[PDB]
């Protein structure tokens, strides 16, 4: 309690809370992230383990962020992987390509070529990349950026109402600690 996160400093209370897509008894958690964001990369093992530990207690999703036109292909990539059902399999290698191999995967052809080395059929991937369904999800993700007033990554949103992230806590461990506190406060009907 004396060490509890401080509202307005360690997390932000949104003036316009957003609809929650989680069912009763689950806390919704959203991570806005960008494949090219170093803190998002570093945070992956931390948030993966925490989400897996919560299990059915939460409904977790990621939303890709393209702050610039040049990075819209990274949001298309995110939704194309999900459409193919290979996200869990290849996403570590995608992060590795960008952050360690200097392959920024900025075009659909570079993505397809890389993903083929990971066992993804290029025609299937490019069909997903260019599909109307993925284009719809990308346009939606940009509307979500606006609706949650997101101006940095990674940003974690709890129950459509509480935002945290290293912009707030100045550390990834602090982000995880605030997230855990927020979810517990929502479960206990304190937030
Ligand atoms: C890790 C790498 O940073 C980048 C991340 C995404 C993009 Br796109 C371009 C560069 C670096 N040069 O240290």
Residue numbers in the entry: 7 to 197
The authors write:
Disulfide-bond-forming protein A (DsbA) catalyzes the formation of the disulfide bonds necessary for the activity and stability of multiple substrate proteins, including many virulence factors. DsbA works in tandem with its membrane-embedded partner protein DsbB, which is required to maintain DsbA in its active, oxidized state. B. pseudomallei is a Gram-negative bacterium that is found predominantly in tropical areas and is the causative agent of the deadly disease melioidosis. Binding was characterized using NMR and X-ray crystallo­graphy. Both 1 and 2 bind to a transient (or ‘cryptic’) pocket on BpsDsbA located adjacent to the redox active site which is not observed in the apo BpsDsbA structure.
Oxidized BpsDsbA was co-crystallized with 1 in 60% Tacsimate (Hampton Research); the resulting crystals diffracted to a resolution of 1.84 Å on beamline MX2 at the Australian Synchrotron and belonged to space group P212121. Additionally, there are π-stacking interactions between the aromatic rings of the fragment and Tyr110 (4.1 Å, measured from the centroid of each ring). The signal was particularly intense for the Br atom, where difference density was visible even above the 20 r.m.s.d. level.
